[PDB]
Structure 1
């Protein structure tokens, strides 16, 4: 009886195995844009992905992960709210059964069709595993997806999904360049939060870009052909793998822009 996104194992049940689900800095949240304050002392955000080296793509039974070789000083996030340097380890998405839902963060209660999470660990802690024992161990760059024009730089991900249709399948995926998934602007909101899947650890500085990327309906329809299930098991389409907004509990959300 593993956690998931269904009636009997979804987000309203996670607190039993993971009581931090009711913690003081859980994610995602609704971003109330009028209450977020501009912070002129945020330094510029720096996203340096030119030497990112992807290994592999994986269906882990809740989403798919695009993995990176994080053994060298490559693909780093710094600046903004962050002290020092954070190294990219993986990205994944959350998405809906319908274009009208799928994001985890919301913006004045608006749900986007999906949300990309680029996950980075603070290099002061040596690797991901020690970073997730720290309150400033991780930084996740979140990017909303809306349905409209296609995102050309997403198509190599879309096309490999047929080979990891089911849980536990992976495929070599070298030379994927995550620069092709960014929007033009790096304006963002930031707040302290958590992982949005079990174990829900409260390690994350969230950086959520204001500008969404556009993906086509056909691209997100191929996300929705994935399966929660393994090969040979009955089909449960991988859709609605998002956690809803959690209580803000007096945290403050800061804006990088006026």
Structure 2
């Protein structure tokens, strides 16, 4: 599976039949149809105690993993019940600035999309969480091209060390708080993982306010390789999934 012509999102249903399930993500967010729900509590992001370990290229993107052996970097509140632990963060981006996000807002595509992946601590581990309907919480942040994002530069500078599939580099002391927009206003809905196995275990929290990144930042992203080291080079670009049918589900807004 990949994002090419022969193994792309239009082909995932053959090995992952759930690809056409009832709560597939991403989706388009209709801001006029989205329901303002007064009972939504503020998001609670506790990341001051976060511990990054490493960054790796798994062939579909780059992941920054964190130590989730203790409640160090957690998400709670909002539409969530219980504590969710940050396990990893990654992005989705395009070959151009006109495309890249997974989630769309009134059909508008953003240059990239940041996902902070957290799991419900009631299930003990990530693996047990991916089987539960309320097992994961993913925080989505859109990226637009404009002014550089200081907090993002440590990531960009390390990409050259993990250009090809399978590479990894130690990546300690990175603070995720530098990737957060100013406002915590959000939209929430029940969805799924966006890459195979596409399990329908996520509670999506998409921030309203996007973060700006500069052209040269995003550019360093487009320089990654889908392929393994020593193989014909396939630029890692357009690693996003097309919007899926909402099918009945309702999108709530905290604003």
- Give TM-score, length-normalised by structure 2: 1.00
Measure how far apart 1:12 and its partner are: 0.2
Tell me the SS of whatever aligns to 1:129: helix
CA distances 1:78-109 after superposition (whole Å, capped 9, x unpaired): 00000011000000000000000000000000
Q: How much is the aligned-residue C-alpha RMSD, in angstroms? A: 0.4
Measure how far apart 1:248 and its partner are: 0.3
Tell me the SS of whatever aligns to 1:12: coil
Measure how far apart 1:15 and its partner are: 0.3
- 5+ unaligned residues in a row in structure 2: which ranges? none
Provide the rounded CA distance (Å) in 1 between the counterparts of 2:234 and 2:67.
Answer: 31
Provide the rounded CA distance (Å) in 1 between the counterparts of 2:67 and 2:84.
Answer: 14
Provide the rounded CA distance (Å) in 2 between the counterparts of 1:184 and 1:20.
Answer: 36
- Of residues 180, 184, 193 in structure 2, which corresponds to 1:186? 184
Q: Which runs of 4+ in 1 moved over 2 A?
A: none
Provide the rounded CA distance (Å) in 2 between the counterparts of 1:41 and 1:126.
Answer: 28
CA distances 1:165-205 after superposition (whole Å, capped 9, x unpaired): 00000000000000000000000000000000000000000
CA distances 1:195-221 after superposition (whole Å, capped 9, x unpaired): 000000000000000000000000000
Provide the rounded CA distance (Å) in 1 between the counterparts of 2:77 and 2:153.
Answer: 29
Provide the rounded CA distance (Å) in 2 between the counterparts of 1:72 and 1:37.
Answer: 35
- Paired residues in the alignment total 255
Tell me the SS of whatever aligns to 2:10: helix
Measure how far apart 1:44 and its partner are: 1.2
Provide the rounded CA distance (Å) in 2 between the counterparts of 1:209 and 1:200.
Answer: 22
- Give TM-score, length-normalised by structure 1: 0.98
CA distances 1:87-146 after superposition (whole Å, capped 9, x unpaired): 000000000000000000000000000000000000010010000010000000000000
Tell me the SS of whatever aligns to 1:10: coil
Measure how far apart 1:43 and its partner are: 1.2
* Paired residues for 1:15-26 under 5 Å: 15-26=13-24
2:203: which partner in 1?
Answer: 205
Provide the rounded CA distance (Å) in 1 between the counterparts of 2:114 and 2:219.
Answer: 16
CA distances 1:25-56 after superposition (whole Å, capped 9, x unpaired): 00000000000011110111101110010010
- Of residues 146, 162, 165 in structure 1, which corresponds to 2:163? 165
- 5+ unaligned residues in a row in structure 1: which ranges? none
